[PDB]
């Protein structure tokens, strides 16, 4: 089983009260791998703050910081098993950010909780 | 629903060649938390090889660096589910480490991937 690893660039520039993308993919495929949670992080926050967003493969994407906040972010392609005739995606971990203030310039860590392999991560500068 | 933390001793000191716990909890307990995974990090380690141990709910433990690895690494109180008669219990990720080498000692880190409040991390030094 080949380890995994995140694939993200490494600076992205949006502009104020527009939107911009974070691409985030965990590679390569790699059957039987799970991928039991992303989540993403501003890794230079206080840090009992650091979480800004996670997606479960059976409940979604939650938001546990009121900054951005859910009005302000969305995970562009990740999908969650809505019933028996849905899977779910994490593969694609891609975020967007919304309405982008200067408060949202600096670093995003993109991480994957898997298993057998463990948590792996990749990191982004928004530049804003 | 409070935030979680991840709480460890800042260091432990093992004997060469005897067995060393290091102690890692989530706390406090927060109904409706769900805990995806838990894993064990070497944050000094080059970065291809940091996670030296996983643990998911439904399937149990895994040891992705073949140091220490599976025979000197053991979660000495998670449990897995293993039928409809068990469920899994992840919020002690206490890990033990068996046969102590000088390899062993360093930084190691008890990182909880949670929902709806992401991944949260606590680091030890085993000292040895
Ligand atoms: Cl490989
Ligand atoms: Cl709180
Ligand atoms: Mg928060
Ligand atoms: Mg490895």
Same mark, same amino acid.
């Not at 660039?9 to 691409?23: A, C, D, I, K, Y």
């Given at each position: 089983?080949?380890?995994?690893?995140?694939?993200?660039?490494?600076?992205?520039?949006?502009?104020?009260?527009?939107?911009?993308?974070?691409?985030?993919?965990?590679?390569?495929?790699?059957?039987?791998?799970?991928?039991?949670?992303?989540?993403?992080?501003?890794?230079?926050?206080? /840090?009992? %703050?650091?979480?800004?967003?996670?997606?479960?493969?059976?409940?979604?994407?939650? +938001?546990?910081?009121?900054?951005? !906040? @859910?009005?302000?972010?969305?995970?562009?392609?990740?999908?969650?098993?809505?019933?028996?005739?849905?899977?779910?995606?994490?593969?694609?971990?891609?975020? /967007?950010? %919304?309405?982008?203030?200067?408060?949202?310039?600096?670093?995003?860590?993109?991480? +994957?909780?898997?298993?057998?392999? !463990? @948590?792996?991560?990749?990191?982004?500068?928004?530049?804003?």
């Amino acid at each position: 089983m080949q380890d995994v690893r995140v694939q993200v660039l490494p600076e992205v520039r949006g502009q104020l009260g527009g939107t911009v993308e974070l691409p985030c993919h965990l590679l390569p495929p790699v059957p039987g791998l799970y991928i039991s949670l992303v989540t993403w992080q501003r890794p230079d926050a206080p /840090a009992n %703050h650091q979480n800004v967003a996670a997606f479960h493969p059976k409940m979604g994407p939650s +938001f546990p910081s009121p900054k951005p !906040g @859910s009005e302000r972010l969305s995970f562009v392609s990740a999908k969650q098993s809505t019933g028996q005739d849905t899977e779910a995606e994490l593969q694609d971990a891609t975020l /967007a950010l %919304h309405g982008l203030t200067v408060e949202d310039e600096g670093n995003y860590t993109c991480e +994957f909780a898997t298993f057998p392999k !463990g @948590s792996v991560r990749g990191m982004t500068w928004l530049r804003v």
